[PDB]
């Protein structure tokens, strides 16, 4: 055991399976959940761990880097750029199934073409954006039509729900046109949680109700400014709901551990960990029967 091997062993083996009854009626205490959360290693990579010349300019935060083994590599669809780097990682889903999500940071003006290239190359049909309206991060989608490198994007439809905005986009590359659904969930401040879990579960139903629209199933892109806290919470919620529906139990600790192996730092706060328990207890009470 290196520190690194102690980290990997913990994340592969930690678990706290809870029956749905225990989650709803007899949950671990707040102090227990915080203690449990603080035990989980971050699995952050250091700048020294990454040998990708030039990547710094494509990171929003120099301390938040994509783990090498699961990072998304861009192909060569950009005649302007020579590298394959984007701050994004493939994320396992329910039962360990590969590439169910990509977690990424919010695009910067200089990584917007990279983002759409990833969307194209990975045959993404759904993007989940988690934000607090408060703006600074750049709008990487057009009001009606914009070109980003070799990609033309066009808004087809836009509808407002109280919790989120759904945009139906078309992305074009050469003679080829694809559909992409975009959902912007807007009252989630970074480092914090939403006021209640109702809208979040609606967002989750919205995601679950989304048709596959690509030639081949692709990852769901989930992002927020750093791509770890709110991104991690959303994905953990989705997996946790899937465990509850299929099995009537959930292992929240194991879900967060599996997320951290895929991308360092997923779920950043003990408050966010506690809210995850709350949201899943809510989902359990909403289940049919």
């Amino acid at each position: 055991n290196t520190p690194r091997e102690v980290t990997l062993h913990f994340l592969r083996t930690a678990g706290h399976p809870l029956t749905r009854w225990a989650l709803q009626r007899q949950p671990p205490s707040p102090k227990q959940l915080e203690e449990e959360f603080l035990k989980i290693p971050s699995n952050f990579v250091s700048p020294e761990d990454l040998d990708i010349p030039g990547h710094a300019s494509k990171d929003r935060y120099k301390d938040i880097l994509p783990n090498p083994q699961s990072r998304v590599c861009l192909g060569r669809a950009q005649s302007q750029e020579d590298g394959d780097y984007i701050n994004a990682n493939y994320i396992r889903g329910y039962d360990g199934k590969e590439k169910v999500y990509i977690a990424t940071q919010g695009p910067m003006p200089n990584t917007v073409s990279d983002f759409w290239e990833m969307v194209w190359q990975e045959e993404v049909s759904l993007i989940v954006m988690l934000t607090q309206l408060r703006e600074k991060c750049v709008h990487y989608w057009p009001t009606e039509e914009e070109t980003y490198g070799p990609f033309q994007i066009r808004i087809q439809d836009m509808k407002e729900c109280p919790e989120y905005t759904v945009r139906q986009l078309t992305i074009q590359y050469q003679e080829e046109r694809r559909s992409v659904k975009h959902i912007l969930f807007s009252a989630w401040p970074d480092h914090q949680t939403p006021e209640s879990a109702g809208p979040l579960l609606r967002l989750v139903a919205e995601v679950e109700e989304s048709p596959e629209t690509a030639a081949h199933p692709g990852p769901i892109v989930v992002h927020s400014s750093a791509g770890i806290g709110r991104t991690g919470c959303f994905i953990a919620t989705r997996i946790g709901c899937q465990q509850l529906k299929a099995r009537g139990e959930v292992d929240i600790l194991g879900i967060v551990c599996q997320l951290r192996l895929d991308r360092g730092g997923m779920i950043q706060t003990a408050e966010q960990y506690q809210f995850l328990h709350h949201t899943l207890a809510l989902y359990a009470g909403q289940l049919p029967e």
């Binding site: 929003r60 935060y61 301390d63 400014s225 770890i228």
Partner: peptide
């Protein structure tokens, strides 16, 4: 920059 710093997110932590």
């Amino acid at each position: 920059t710093e997110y932590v």
